[PDB]
Amino acid sequence: MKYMITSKGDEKSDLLRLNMIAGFGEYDMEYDDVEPEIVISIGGDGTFLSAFHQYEERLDEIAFIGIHTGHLGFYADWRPAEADKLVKLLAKGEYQKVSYPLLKTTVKYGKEATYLALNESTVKSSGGPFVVDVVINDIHFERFRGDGLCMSTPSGTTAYNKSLGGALMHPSIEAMQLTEMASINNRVYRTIGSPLVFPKHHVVSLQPVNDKDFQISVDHLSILHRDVQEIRYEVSAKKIHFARFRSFPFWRRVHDSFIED
Amino acid sequence: MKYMITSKGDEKSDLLRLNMIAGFGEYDMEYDDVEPEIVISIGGDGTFLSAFHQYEERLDEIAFIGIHTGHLGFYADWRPAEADKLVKLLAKGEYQKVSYPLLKTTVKYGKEATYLALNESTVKSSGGPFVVDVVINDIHFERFRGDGLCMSTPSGTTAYNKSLGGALMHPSIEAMQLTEMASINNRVYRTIGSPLVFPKHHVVSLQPVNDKDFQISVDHLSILHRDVQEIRYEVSAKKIHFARFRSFPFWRRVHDSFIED
Amino acid sequence: MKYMITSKGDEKSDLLRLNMIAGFGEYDMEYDDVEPEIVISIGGDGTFLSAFHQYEERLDEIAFIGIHTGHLGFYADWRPAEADKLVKLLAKGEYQKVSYPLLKTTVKYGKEATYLALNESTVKSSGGPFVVDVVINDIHFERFRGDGLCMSTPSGTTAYNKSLGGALMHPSIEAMQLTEMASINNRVYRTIGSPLVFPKHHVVSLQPVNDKDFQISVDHLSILHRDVQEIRYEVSAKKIHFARFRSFPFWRRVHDSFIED
Amino acid sequence: MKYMITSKGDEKSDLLRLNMIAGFGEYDMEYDDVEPEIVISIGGDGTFLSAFHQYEERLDEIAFIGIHTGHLGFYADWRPAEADKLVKLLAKGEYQKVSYPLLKTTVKYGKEATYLALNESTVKSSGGPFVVDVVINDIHFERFRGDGLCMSTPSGTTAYNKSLGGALMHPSIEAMQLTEMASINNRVYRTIGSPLVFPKHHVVSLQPVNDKDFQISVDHLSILHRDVQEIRYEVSAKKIHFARFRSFPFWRRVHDSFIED
Numbered sequence A, B, C, D: 001m002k003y004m005i006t007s008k009g010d011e012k013s014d015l016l017r018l019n020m021i022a023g024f025g026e027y028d029m030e031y032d033d034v035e036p037e038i039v040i041s042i043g044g045d046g047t048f049l050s051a052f053h054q055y056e057e058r059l060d061e062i063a064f065i066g067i068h069t070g071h072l073g074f075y076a077d078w079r080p081a082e083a084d085k086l087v088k089l090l091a092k093g094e095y096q097k098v099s100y101p102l103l104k105t106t107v108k109y110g111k112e113a114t115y116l117a118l119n120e121s122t123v124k125s126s127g128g129p130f131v132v133d134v135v136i137n138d139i140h141f142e143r144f145r146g147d148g149l150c151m152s153t154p155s156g157t158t159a160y161n162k163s164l165g166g167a168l169m170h171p172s173i174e175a176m177q178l179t180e181m182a183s184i185n186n187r188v189y190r191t192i193g194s195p196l197v198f199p200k201h202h203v204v205s206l207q208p209v210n211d212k213d214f215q216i217s218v219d220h221l222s223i224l225h226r227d228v229q230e231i232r233y234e235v236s237a238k239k240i241h242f243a244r245f246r247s248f249p250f251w252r253r254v255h256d257s258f259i260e261d
């Protein structure tokens, strides 16, 4: 089975990658980073986020596996000491695939750029006040004045969305969550304040009022966009597939990361 | 078609109820408050909450309609001036039914009491510190020390859940949201803090650690329970059905109630 | 010098109290719990809160010292192993006194009851909705609809006030902080939301609108008051005096309790 | 008495400025924008913030007066229709001066730049993660990982500080308030979360851990600083003086801006 391994680049990860490649050499495994079917990420969530975006063109043909050699590693399922057991089970061929929802961002100018997000997509102004009109399913909902907005995937609700006061969403729910970044609320300006959870087929559209330049982020990326007509959020039809070998429930994954471990 | 009308009891609502009953007398409508198929609530959300719990035994045979003669009326779809137009359209027979998810609470002693909630169910201690262990799908998640907890339905996320910092959930999502009530967090005590959104088939169980007496609420009700072994939260299989005659999206319903109208 | 020692009542604290009394027998120390000048609390903040209220009539003649045999002990300055060093230094007579501001609560009926608080005073309704008008210096400020309100002292801002989202206030600032308990905010109801920090000589008055029965708390006490005309908050002119033997800054005291130790 | 008038630059403000100058020509008033003793700002808080920073070198010789021709105008005391009454009373010479505390920011490189703030000073990274060690009075308190930090003056607590969850502080209290901007908190990263209120003579120092480039803001200004060794916060010894002609308490000023008017 075709596979590839990406590494954080530090000593522990590079060496662990070579050992697994040597271990995979003892099975019917072929290293191919062009068309892999198993993508193994050795590092942290940042290394895992990069592996996902490196292969977003074949998310339907790829199952992801995360080994964390770092501090937290929310998307990882493996310690480095358990690596040789992973080589064997992945070679045995039997494991189960679980799928998490993804976010779709479409940006329009005056062409059209689309993006896929595993954690979240956020909007901020390119210096100066950030003002947008929030349109939900072609109905105007509010005018946002603040630092920015964050639209999160389910599995991304434990990341940036959490620090903004958002709720934690189990990834079996196909939804997206929008949170505020320090909105101004007074006699003249009024926002909902609360986070909003949108289901599938619901389209959130941001429309500029004054400045049309915004710094848009997709996970670790941060892009500057000029002459923006509209930013559109939507639950993607594509999903990310994880190869699972034991039971690690999302809520237990939450407990270990934030309560104790 | 069998129907009944409940009223807040004030002058405006009682008179509006008599006019509609007289108006329904001009159609093939029969007043029956024992086995109605249409339940019309004239008043506020409190009047509507009471109508729901008055007929929770036949939620599969009943469609609800809300007329608000009060201040907000989140569950209402009608102004009192539009009442005679409602009599006609409901008599015409053609309207569409929409269904919102409900919450199930099961309380255990040492028998078993169950409840259905449209807004939320909350737990507090019967005086003294409130301490419970939070068990999600038979896995211990946290020990909560604070004033209480609130488990909300989707349509109830705009109510008590909102004031506790929870997120607003579109009612097409079959979920329940758990929020905290002033948990203590220090070197010794640690909670997740963030609200939690659970899908269907997920069972949240609260287990006492010290005191076993808790004041449990279901919407406007507030009960004292003694010798409690376990409180269990779960998305109900039963749903509440609304009779809709025009389009009033949940997000527009949110906008009018909190932004402006 | 006259002194007394109060104890949590468990084995470790009672024995530690007897050892110090025997140790104080080797100096010019006299045990007097009627008119002490040094009050030593062995236990936790709850034990310390009780010692303060046990002697609130002579707060100008008394310096307090806290030994924590429990979990956190925010008001304590001593481990039980350091106890015999405390007997010696307190006998040596030289230590410095620091003073923290106190809160004054005045409740009026239709007589007048006053209270002193070290942590906070909170108001809730006696079952049913809690509605009060908030009057700051005889000017109406807002109508509060929610679960309750919390007025905190500086040293009490790390307690209940903190869990409600309040700010942490250094006790050299003579102020009181008012925080909300789950206020309802919509088209009809509007509160400030933010915590409010009032200086000395500023009088916060709560005035009932409907129900006149409220459950008022002062630290660990919780009282039911009937026929309430007014609840009044104010920075007390009396202060609590602490006997300090080494430097333990408030911010370092904050760090150990909430960051790590 | 020497005075000057600054204007937002729009039609209503420029014309109002000319009318007052013509009105002041009927008294012993001399227009001098080099060494004025009365500075009148016609516009909004942004226009008022600019007038303050335009004359921060003579804050001890200057009393400020605000006329708001815009939307909110928190620092203003006058409607444009009341302008001719202001010319007369200011000419009559009798009014009372009130003083608000100011914030001092000192930035160090590897020289030393200082700034005075009326609202707040905030720190963010120059792209990339923002990590600083928070040192209070030479004692390390926490390592902050997030978007940034905001240190506010009392009168500035109703501005940016409020949108970040901070408390509202009466300006008779000589203090500064530090709030967080979306800190990350998990098993590895831990911050206090709560806002912190520091008294006079308390020195908050931010110390870089990785990147030494930060975008520092002072009110409406935003500067990029390179090779930063330390950012230092402190309650200034200088204060801003307001000319007051009637009673407008800070809490009533708060009520009008956020509750209703």
Ligand SMILES: CCNC(=O)NC[C@H]1O[C@@H](n2c(C#CCOC[C@H]3O[C@@H](n4cnc5c(N)ncnc54)[C@H](O)[C@@H]3O)nc3c(N)ncnc32)[C@H](O)[C@@H]1O
Binding pocket: A044, A045, A046, A049, A072, A073, A074, A075, A119, A120, A155, A156, A157, A158, A159, A160, A161, A163, A219, A220, A257, D129, D130, D145, D146, D147, D181, D182, D183, D184, D186
């Ligand atoms: C700059 C401060 N960030 C970090 O240091 N991140 C790393 C920490 O994030 C943990 N982590 C990541 C991830 C990742 C790496 O990519 C950058 C991501 O950074 C996040 N982010 C941005 N700004 C943030 C902010 N202010 N507060 C909180 N998070 C913020 C955004 O989600 C962005 O996608 N995913 C998750 C996750 N699903 N669940 C739990 N933890 C996660 C990860 O293990 C590590 O601990």
Ligand SMILES: CCNC(=O)NC[C@H]1O[C@@H](n2c(C#CCOC[C@H]3O[C@@H](n4cnc5c(N)ncnc54)[C@H](O)[C@@H]3O)nc3c(N)ncnc32)[C@H](O)[C@@H]1O
Binding pocket: B044, B045, B046, B049, B072, B073, B074, B075, B119, B120, B155, B156, B157, B158, B159, B160, B161, B163, B219, B220, B257, C129, C130, C145, C146, C147, C181, C182, C183, C184, C186
């Ligand atoms: C005591 C303070 N409550 C109220 O005054 N309620 C009435 C206000 O609630 C509005 N309203 C109700 C409802 C109802 C009546 O029943 C009592 C309900 O009260 C709520 N509640 C309890 N304590 C609360 C608190 N502290 N803050 C906020 N809400 C709290 C609990 O949900 C409990 O079910 N439903 C909703 C709704 N889906 N969406 C939007 N608004 C709603 C309603 O129209 C009215 O404006």
Ligand SMILES: CCNC(=O)NC[C@H]1O[C@@H](n2c(C#CCOC[C@H]3O[C@@H](n4cnc5c(N)ncnc54)[C@H](O)[C@@H]3O)nc3c(N)ncnc32)[C@H](O)[C@@H]1O
Binding pocket: B129, B130, B145, B146, B147, B181, B182, B183, B184, B186, C044, C045, C046, C049, C072, C073, C074, C075, C119, C120, C155, C156, C157, C158, C159, C160, C161, C163, C219, C220, C257
């Ligand atoms: C019921 C949940 N409480 C507790 O368990 N308290 C004990 C914890 O409080 C710590 N502690 C106490 C104190 C005390 C004992 O008295 C009861 C006090 O309880 C508080 N309280 C009430 N309800 C609360 C809530 N929901 N959340 C948070 N705190 C709440 C109210 O301030 C009330 O005065 N003082 C402080 C303090 N200055 N700073 C830091 N920690 C403190 C103490 O060491 C222990 O850890």
Ligand SMILES: CCNC(=O)NC[C@H]1O[C@@H](n2c(C#CCOC[C@H]3O[C@@H](n4cnc5c(N)ncnc54)[C@H](O)[C@@H]3O)nc3c(N)ncnc32)[C@H](O)[C@@H]1O
Binding pocket: A129, A130, A145, A146, A147, A181, A182, A183, A184, A186, D044, D045, D046, D049, D072, D073, D074, D075, D119, D120, D155, D156, D157, D158, D159, D160, D161, D163, D219, D220, D257
């Ligand atoms: C970009 C979004 N800002 C605004 O639009 N500001 C204007 C609104 O601020 C009101 N206003 C100002 C001021 C000012 C102008 O200068 C810029 C200031 O902007 C603030 N600011 C920055 N980012 C913010 C954010 N995310 N949320 C909230 N406020 C933020 C920062 O304090 C910075 O000093 N002072 C105050 C004040 N003391 N009290 C009450 N309202 C005030 C003012 O009248 C107007 O309504």
